[PDB]
C-alpha cells in the first residue's frame, strides 16, 4: 500500500539508496567515492558552460579562453571550478584507490576491474582536457605524447593520422580532442553506474575486513547526512581553492600562447600525472617506457591476484602497514621527482624510487603476507 514499495521508481530508489544495508563502522574514507560522483556532476555542469563560449580554432581558441575569463560574467569562476575540480577529482580518486589498497577492497574482482577501467578513462580525459586551452605547455605535452604514441611500430601512424588530421597543427586536431573530451566523461558516468551495480550485490566492506552481516544499518539517514557533510566539506575546500588561491596548483607557463619554434626550459604537466612522468624519466626506452607506464597502472588490476594472506584488511597486519606507508612515501617521492629538472641527483633518486615502487607493489607484499601468515601459526 505504501508508495515506497509498490511504485517502481520509489522501489528502485528505496532498494539502492535508502534501505540498502551498510556496515555501521565505516570511516570517513567511505564517503570519498560518493564525493567523486558529485565531483563528476560539477565538471559536467562546467562542461555545459564550456560548450557555450569555446571555439576550436587555435589562436581564437586561446582568445575565447581569455574571453571566458573576462567577457562572460562568472566565466572565470566556471573555468577555475573546472581546473580546481579536476585537481579535487584526482585527490579524491587517489584517496579512493588508497582506501581500496589498504582495507582489502580489491577482493571484489569485477568492481576492481571496472574501477581500473574508469581510472584509465579519467586519466585520458584529464590529459586530453589539458590539451584544449592551447598553451605552450599543453602544446609541448601534446607533441611529446603523440610522438611517444607514434614511436610504436606500425600502429601509432594511423592514430597520429586520425588524431592530428594533417601535416601540422590544424583545427581538425582540436575539434577531435574537444569531441573526445566531450564524449568520454559520459562513458565514465556509465561505468560509474556499472561500478555501483556490481557493488550492490555483494555489500560494502567495513574497515575491519570481517563479515559485517552481524551489524548492519540502513543507509538513510546515517550515511545520507554523513555524505551531505562530506559534500559540504568538499565544496568548502574546492571553493577555498577557487576563490583564494586559484593558481597554486596550476602551472603558470600554460597561460602564454603556444609557439612551436621555442622550447620551454622545463616541460611539466599537472601533479596528478607527474609520477607517471617520473616513470618516463626512469628508463631510456620509448616502447619500454610505454610498457612501464601501462604496466604501472595495470598492476593495480593484477594486485587482487597477489593477495597471499588469509586475512583481508591491513588493520591487523602491521608489517604490511609499514610496507603500504613506505609505498605512499615513495609514490610521493615520484610525484616530487616528476616536477624537477633532469639533473644530478634527481636521476638516481627517480630510478631507485621507480624500482622500489615496482618492488613494493609486486614482489615484497607476498613475502610480507607469508611472514604475517607464519607469525600467527597458519603457514606450512
Amino acid at each position: 500500500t505504501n508508495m515506497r514499495k509498490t511504485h517502481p521508481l520509489f522501489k528502485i530508489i528505496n532498494h539502492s539508496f535508502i534501505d540498502l544495508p551498510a556496515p555501521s563502522n565505516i570511516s570517513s574514507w567511505w564517503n570519498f567515492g560518493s564525493l567523486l560522483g558529485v565531483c563528476l556532476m560539477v565538471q559536467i555542469i562546467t562542461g555545459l558552460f564550456l560548450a557555450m563560449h569555446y571555439t576550436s580554432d587555435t589562436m581564437t581558441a586561446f582568445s575565447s579562453v581569455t574571453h571566458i575569463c573576462r567577457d562572460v560574467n562568472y566565466g572565470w569562476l566556471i573555468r577555475y571550478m573546472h581546473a580546481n575540480g579536476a585537481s579535487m577529482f584526482f585527490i579524491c580518486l587517489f584517496l579512493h584507490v588508497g582506501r581500496g589498497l589498504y582495507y582489502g577492497s580489491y577482493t571484489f574482482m569485477e568492481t576492481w576491474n571496472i574501477g581500473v577501467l574508469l581510472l584509465f578513462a579519467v586519466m585520458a580525459t584529464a590529459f586530453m582536457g589539458y590539451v584544449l586551452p592551447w598553451g605552450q605547455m599543453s602544446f609541448w605535452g601534446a607533441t611529446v605524447i603523440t610522438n611517444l604514441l607514434s614511436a610504436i611500430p606500425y600502429i601509432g601512424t594511423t592514430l597520429v593520422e586520425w588524431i592530428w588530421g594533417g601535416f601540422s597543427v590544424d583545427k581538425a586536431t582540436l575539434t577531435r580532442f574537444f569531441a573526445f573530451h566531450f564524449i568520454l566523461p559520459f562513458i565514465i558516468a556509465a561505468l560509474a553506474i556499472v561500478h555501483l551495480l556490481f557493488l550492490h550485490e555483494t555489500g560494502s566492506n567495513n574497515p575491519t575486513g570481517l563479515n559485517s552481516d552481524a551489524d548492519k544499518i540502513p543507509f538513510h539517514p546515517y550515511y545520507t547526512i554523513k555524505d551531505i557533510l562530506g559534500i559540504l566539506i568538499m565544496f568548502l575546500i574546492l571553493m577555498t581553492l577557487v576563490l583564494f588561491f586559484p593558481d597554486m596548483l596550476g602551472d603558470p607557463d600554460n597561460y602564454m600562447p603556444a609557439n612551436p619554434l621555442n622550447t620551454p626550459p622545463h616541460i611539466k604537466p599537472e601533479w596528478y600525472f607527474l609520477f607517471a612522468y617520473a616513470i618516463l624519466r626512469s628508463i631510456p626506452n620509448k616502447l619500454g617506457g610505454v610498457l612501464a607506464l601501462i604496466l604501472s597502472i595495470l598492476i593495480l588490476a593484477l594486485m587482487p591476484f597477489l593477495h597471499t594472506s588469509k586475512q583481508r584488511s591491513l588493520m591487523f597486519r602491521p608489517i604490511t602497514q609499514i610496507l603500504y606507508w613506505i609505498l605512499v612515501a615513495n609514490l610521493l617521492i615520484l610525484t616530487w621527482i616528476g616536477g624537477q629538472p633532469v639533473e644530478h641527483p634527481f636521476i638516481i633518486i627517480g630510478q631507485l624510487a621507480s624500482i622500489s615502487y615496482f618492488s613494493i607493489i609486486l614482489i615484497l607484499m607476498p613475502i610480507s603476507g607469508i611472514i604475517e601468515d607464519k607469525m600467527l601459526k597458519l603457514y606450512p
Binding site: 582568445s63 547526512i225 551531505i228 576563490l243 603558470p252 607557463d253 597561460y255 626550459p265
Partner: protein
C-alpha cells in the same frame, strides 16, 4: 651562468587573503603604461570597457578612446576609413607582425603583457625586481650591443634598456614619480591585467567563508544527533551455558 635569483617577497597591499587592489595605483600604473610602456609592448586581451569602474568613470575613460586614434579597417568602398576610437576597442598594437617587432627592436620580441604576471614565476615581485634591479654588468661577461645586464632575467641579458628614471612622468593625483613608485604602480596595474577578477573573487571568498561557517555546525549537529542514537547502544550476550 644559468643559475638565477628568485625575486624577494614584497609586502604588497593585495598580499592578504582579503586584501584588494589600490585602484588609485591601478589607474596610476595604467597611465604609466599609456605614456611610456606602450611604445614596444602590447595588450591584446584588454579593452577600454574594462577600465570603467576600476580606473576611471564612464566618460573620461571613453575620452581616452579618442586620444589614441585606433583604426578598424575595411568597408565596401575599399579605402582605409579613418574613425575615432570607442570603448569597445582593444588596446592598440605597436607592430603589425612579430618579425617587424624583432627587426625594429633589436631581434628580441616585446611579448604580450596582459598575462606576463601569470605566465612567469614570482608574479608581480619578479616584475618589480626586473624593473628596479638594473645594475652594471660585472667582469667576465661580455654582452653584445643593445643587451643590458639584469640578474633576474634568465640568461642575465635583457633585451630592453631601463625605461624609468628620475622625473620621467607626472601624475594627475599628485604623486612624486620616483623609480620605486612608478615600478610599483606599473606592477600593480600589470597585475590587474592578468586578474581583473580579484575584488569579486575575494567578495565571493568571504561570502563563501561566512556561509560555510554558518552551515557546517548545523550539519555537524544533525550528524551527531543521528549517530548519537547509535553511539548510546550497549550490547549484551546471554548464552544458555
Amino acid at each position: 651562468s644559468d643559475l638565477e635569483l628568485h625575486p624577494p617577497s614584497y609586502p604588497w597591499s593585495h598580499r592578504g587573503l582579503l586584501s584588494s587592489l589600490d585602484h588609485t595605483s591601478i589607474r596610476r600604473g595604467f597611465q604609466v603604461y599609456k605614456q611610456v610602456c606602450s611604445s614596444c609592448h602590447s595588450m591584446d586581451y584588454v579593452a577600454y570597457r574594462h577600465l570603467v569602474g576600476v580606473c576611471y568613470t564612464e566618460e573620461e575613460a571613453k575620452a581616452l578612446a579618442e586620444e589614441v586614434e585606433v583604426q578598424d579597417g575595411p568597408n565596401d568602398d575599399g579605402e582605409m576609413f579613418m574613425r575615432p576610437g570607442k570603448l569597445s576597442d582593444y588596446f592598440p598594437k605597436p607592430y603589425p607582425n612579430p618579425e617587424a617587432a624583432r627587426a625594429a627592436n633589436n631581434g628580441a620580441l616585446p611579448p604580450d603583457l596582459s598575462y606576463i604576471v601569470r605566465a612567469r614565476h614570482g608574479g608581480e615581485d619578479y616584475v618589480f625586481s626586473l624593473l628596479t634591479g638594473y645594475c652594471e654588468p660585472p667582469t667576465g661577461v661580455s654582452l653584445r650591443e643593445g643587451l643590458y645586464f639584469n640578474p633576474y632575467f634568465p640568461g642575465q641579458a635583457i633585451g630592453m634598456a631601463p625605461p624609468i628614471y628620475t622625473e620621467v612622468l607626472e601624475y594627475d593625483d599628485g604623486t612624486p614619480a620616483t623609480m620605486s613608485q612608478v615600478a610599483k604602480d606599473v606592477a600593480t596595474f600589470l597585475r590587474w591585467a592578468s586578474e581583473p577578477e580579484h575584488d569579486h573573487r575575494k567578495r565571493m571568498g568571504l561570502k563563501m567563508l561566512l556561509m560555510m561557517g554558518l552551515l557546517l555546525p548545523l550539519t555537524y549537529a544533525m550528524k551527531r544527533h543521528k549517530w548519537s542514537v547509535l553511539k548510546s547502544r550497549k550490547l549484551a550476550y546471554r548464552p544458555p551455558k
